[PDB]
């Protein structure tokens, strides 16, 4: 798939808002993911023990990881489709070390959309959401293809 320049502009305009508070958005997105799909929390030996949202919010480790995740995703989005170099190491660790099925990447995509919808209604109308969805679908399609090449495609 290929996004138009207009679609990338919608994606990067809302991402610029997210970047005003990377740590806050990161906490919201990961907590939304762990609450909506508790099975995903099982993949994190570091966070598996967290029992409630209050505990998740108070974890400094979880917040730091959210910043690491959003910074990586942000670098990918900014390449506007030419993200092959960035995807390689991410695909390798998530397929071989962490063992993260494409289904889970769908769950976090849903979490990202929910959080942007709640915090940025003015910059995340229908057209903007469609563009963000398309960007994340592209991300998932390319990651899936790399998974296959790496021998996982899980
Ligand atoms: C937009 C989606 C994602 C991005 C950009 C992303 C990014 C990252 C980054 C940059 C790290 C650091 C280095 C590495 O190990 O590769 C990481 C680690 C990890 N990721 Fe992701 N990830 C994504 C989705 C997921 C999902 C959906 C799961 C699980 C449900 C997952 C599980 C993990 C685990 C288990 C680790 C290591 C945690 C630790 O250091 O203890 N990732 N991810």
From Swiss-Prot:
Gene Ontology CC terms: extracellular exosome; sarcoplasm
Residues the record lists as binding nitrite: 65
Enzyme superclass (EC): oxidoreductase
Catalytic activity entry: Fe(III)-heme b-[protein] + nitric oxide + H2O = Fe(II)-heme b-[protein] + nitrite + 2 H(+); H2O2 + AH2 = A + 2 H2O
Single Gene Ontology BP annotation: removal of superoxide radicals
Pfam family, one: Globin
Location of Phosphoserine modifications: 4
MF term (GO), any: nitrite reductase activity
InterPro entries xref list: Globin, Globin-like_sf, Myoglobin
Positions that bind O2: 65
Residues involved in heme b binding: 94
Location in the cell: Cytoplasm, Sarcoplasm
Entry-annotated residues carrying Phosphothreonine: 68
EC code: 1.7.-.-, 1.11.1.-
Keywords: Cytoplasm, Heme, Iron, Metal-binding, Muscle protein, Oxidoreductase, Oxygen transport, Phosphoprotein, Transport
Globin domain mapped to chain residues: 2-148
UniProt keyword annotation of Protein biosynthesis present: no
Gene3D superfamilies: 6.10.140.2100, 6.10.140.2110
Signal peptide: none
Subunit structure: Monomeric.
PANTHER family xref list: MYOGLOBIN
Family according to the record: Belongs to the globin family.
Cited function: Monomeric heme protein which primary function is to store oxygen and facilitate its diffusion within muscle tissues. Reversibly binds oxygen through a pentacoordinated heme iron and enables its timely and efficient release as needed during periods of heightened demand. Depending on the oxidative conditions of tissues and cells, and in addition to its ability to bind oxygen, it also has a nitrite reductase activity whereby it regulates the production of bioactive nitric oxide.
Protein name: Myoglobin
Organism annotation: Physeter macrocephalus
Organism phylogeny: Eukaryota, Metazoa, Chordata, Craniata, Vertebrata
